[PDB]
Symmetry: C5
Subunit: 237 residues, 5 copies
């Protein structure tokens, strides 16, 4: 039910990044192929309860080789899966990178937008395989929360407005992360055109809302989306 | 039989949050050797069950760079020190990197007396009846501004704080430790909940009151975990 | 070169540091590993451009840097993932990693016609020049400004730098959204004291105070062919 | 004794953490290592004073702390380099390291005569008391004030602390120029709840807002003879 | 015999500060093997005795996370690069974790000319005649404001700076390297002294002038060490 998890509300989303130790290559090739096999099996073992997608950060994001985007209706399940993964022979040679959670929620400000804008917001992304993926954690300043509903709705309409020209070439998803870690939002983007995504962020950097981002990125995780087998394959030969 | 509940609720009781992370080499130990290690620890906690209260949380896979957390109640910190030092001594403890470590006294309320009587009434309910609830720990440091204020001013801020939280008194258990002078934070807040989505909302609500902007440090780290008996946690390290 | 001057070309800066246990390897093993990499680079020399810098002894916690030009970052990813896969790469701790596309000038058009002319000069005729890389993040104020305001700030920026237009080669990469910086600046020079003066000069204009992040890290190295660098790793 | 109260006596705070690979050592080798250190300390007990604190289980990433007094830092350097040279010292990752000279009072003379009187009492009747160490750095503003202004700030500081003069011993080291802090504060007490109140009290005076750095780390430990501390690592 | 001092006093001479920390595995080497390693380095330095000047400082036990520091003078940084790369290559170097690394040009005074003639006279004095003095290194970054100032304003600030420091020209040797553009600081300051208490007072004095508040970065790290010949430092790593 990928359909259900990727779009519904109440679905927790977790982003876990990992980096491979050096002593992993001190292991003989044989030991490594077995290790890869263990993990692929574990992920397949969980495919019933949760969704797991893989990203190659190696060579695009500093100090990170692999990232999982995990959807689940409870974080407990996500915990059980991640603790197991980190337990495997492969997991034991991975230094845990960033770990961020956030629930997907129903839109809060879109209702107060022009009806013509709601129409355009119907489109989310393109039809693409092995797209780039970008993840940007966000913390708002105290000011942002002090604002009243009308004020923020105005800021968001300005945010949305600037982004409309990229509505097709950049898929987007927003996770509400407050209280589960040190950020207010987790933003997630898929795109085949990074030059568009770059322009999309400069455009958003010029709206008013932007200056309220006490934390913007750190880390800004850039990677290529790919099946788990092809990623681990690189660590076996 | 045993008034264990006193430590968990009484005032003057020091409360300590110690996190640990497991080394990679812990699995170089044979599966059997690891299960023996669990028993060593389980016994040690039981040996101390007279002097202190110890509760366990699985942080692995929810909190970055942390696998295990203990919430230790004790009427003096030397005792907590001895136990934690002993724990780190067990075979298992020898393969644990000490993570964050925070202390704080639980005290009788300072501002609640100046609230409306209807508010004092509602604050009697603390949490739900739940087993294996999520647990959250958020360290907090107030800015210099906050301390410069007078009692009346602060009493007003906290009354606003309480009001914002009222819709969540049931679905979120709470406890506050006074941590100033024992480390680099002023308070240690601790919460149990079965619905994190509520807790998320509880925090968005508090983010919008006045008091909030006086938190020079809020979280960093924000420790999220599952509450569970010590056996089941250590069991996981024996696969 | 097509990649070095045209727009739309991604530029990537990847830093590496050599592990201690690398020298525990026997002399033979070290030289064979060197050969593996040299081959990998030529293997990619068709799809991408790769240049090397010895940071060892000039930049802290860094021995080596690659500047990789490519029309897609996927290629750069594949190459870097491969490089770190070689026996040599397996003894390298990934240092800093930054990407940025080369873009068509945004403010130069609004400059005086005499200034546009002078900007045609970029650098000197030099081999094995020093190289410097300085990442930059602008503050929120800077983006809020209007085109005229920014066009003005940059014109003052350009003005301060004109006396160094000859002795300092320059290139600017637009890095926003691919990492935690807005620009990646890259400079080649034979005279660092000139480059030092160029930066002290720029520190005094208005624009400068809008650089929320300036350096961190400031990567200083000598430019050199890949062979000569790895050779030091063949002792 | 001699050193703990006179001026011109440098005081050094050194923290250490025991590595994991220490428990891979056989039990005997560890006791021999323990014996080594105990000897080195007694060997130096003539020239300098050294005291021990068990931070293990009270301060994160710290097991042991030394408070070393000496009339010159040269001596303290020699001792600390030697200590870290010992078999045990080789299994300790150095934590924080801070220096500060003990100096004669600067602001106390301008206080009320009744206040000078009360400050004569310093501490309690305690054995194996808790110890707290808090580094402090003042902001630029604090130094900009004139002597009269600061003297007022200190008098408000002193006033707030008077109720705790008996249950809390204090010592102040002047650390500017020997590291990245201006002051190192050190306190012994049997009641932490008192010390807690002492710090909550002082947080409310005016002076406090001038502390650009407060703690980081705030080292909490129990004071104990070196023998009983090392004993735990010989099991 | 050797005009070594060309580097220590001339302008246009790059000065580089490199710190190192000794790995744990260095003591796995047999005693004899370590002494040979010392000889290798002593030789490498003497091999370079033509092109550069190298001085050594023992940071072990005075500076956090650092054992050894080199102050290297060279007319080009490439030479310093090659030397440091060779040094880091030696048997000894292979067991050293590279700490901080900072470069800076020695330049002729910019503000001293605009001072009173009585002040220029006093500034002729630099330091004392002392052996094995303490050494301090403080990296510095000025804020944007400082550069926005005009020459006259900065000259005033520096004259106030100089004035505050006049009482210490005897007990504290000083040197200033202009570091902007070679790393993340604008200046590298270097001091030798037999009396740290004097150096301490010197810094409180400078903390009270106007100029000081423009130091966006001050120290971090503040490197304190004892100056000594390379052999006696390395000698300590052989026992
Ligand atoms: C085509 C691109 C984008 C579109 C259409 C878009 C639109 C929106 C909309 C409509 C909302 C609020 C809707 C609601 O909660 O009811 C929102 C929220 C948000 N967006 Fe975007 N956005 C885009 C790109 C981006 C980018 C590139 C970032 C980069 C950081 C970003 C960061 C955020 C954050 C942090 C929020 C949370 C604000 C809040 O709800 O309080 N968005 N976006
Ligand atoms: C159901 C949820 C909550 C309720 C009913 C509640 C209520 C209260 C009350 C009545 C006090 C004053 C008690 C006293 O010290 O006399 C207080 C203090 C405090 N609360 Fe909460 N609160 C809730 C949630 C939270 C959360 C979610 C946080 C932070 C993440 C938080 C942080 C604090 C802090 C730092 C204080 C100490 C203020 C001080 O004594 O100076 N509280 N709370
Ligand atoms: C001889 C030396 C230099 C010259 C001639 C020069 C000239 C220019 C020019 C003409 C532009 C406008 C680009 C455009 O219109 O898109 C520019 C942009 C820029 N320069 Fe330089 N520059 C020099 C050195 C430097 C240095 C040393 C730094 C930083 C350490 C730097 C940082 C930047 C940045 C961050 C931008 C992009 C600003 C923006 O597009 O918003 N430049 N430079
Ligand atoms: C019983 C408790 C305390 C007493 C009686 C006390 C009293 C004093 C007095 C009289 C001075 C001025 C010394 C002089 O004239 O040179 C002073 C200095 C200082 N105290 Fe305290 N204090 C106490 C606790 C604390 C605590 C708990 C802290 C920090 C958490 C602290 C931080 C400082 C600092 C940073 C200075 C140096 C100020 C300066 O010289 O510029 N003190 N103290
Ligand atoms: C006896 C001690 C000292 C004396 C006589 C002294 C004197 C001077 C003088 C005359 C200058 C002007 C140099 C020029 O024209 O370029 C200067 C520059 C400078 N001094 Fe000192 N100083 C002393 C100590 C210190 C200390 C202890 C520090 C920092 C911890 C320091 C930081 C600086 C810096 C950063 C500059 C460069 C400012 C600029 O060129 O914009 N000085 N000093
Ligand atoms: C915005 N997603
Ligand atoms: C609120 N504890
Ligand atoms: C300037 N590039
Ligand atoms: C106050 N020492
Ligand atoms: C002034 N050095």
């Amino acid at each position: 039910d990928r359909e259900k998890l990727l779009t519904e509300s109440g679905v927790y989303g977790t982003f876990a990044t990992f980096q491979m130790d050096h002593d992993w290559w001190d292991l003989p090739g044989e030991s490594r192929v077995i290790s890869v096999a263990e993990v692929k099996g574990l992920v397949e073992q969980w495919s019933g309860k949760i969704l797991v997608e893989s990203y190659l950060l190696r060579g695009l994001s500093d100090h990170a080789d692999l990232m999982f985007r995990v959807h689940a209706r409870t974080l407990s399940d996500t915990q059980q899966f991640l603790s197991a993964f980190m337990g495997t022979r492969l997991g034991r040679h991975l230094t845990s990178g960033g770990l961020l959670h956030g629930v997907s929620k129903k839109p809060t400000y879109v209702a107060g937008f022009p009806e013509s804008m709601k129409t355009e917001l119907q489109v989310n992304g393109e039809s693409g395989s092995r797209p780039y993926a970008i993840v940007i954690p966000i913390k708002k300043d105290a000011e942002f929360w002090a604002l009243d509903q009308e004020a923020r709705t105005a800021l968001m309409q300005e945010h949305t407005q600037a982004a409309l020209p990229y509505l097709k070439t950049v898929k987007r998803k927003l996770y509400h992360s407050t209280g589960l870690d040190d950020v207010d939002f987790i933003t997630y983007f898929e795109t085949e055109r990074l030059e568009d995504f770059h322009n999309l962020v400069r455009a958003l950097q010029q709206v008013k809302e932007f200056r309220h981002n006490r934390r913007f990125g750190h880390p800004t995780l850039l990677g290529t989306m790919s099946p788990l087998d092809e990623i681990l394959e690189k660590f076996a030969q």
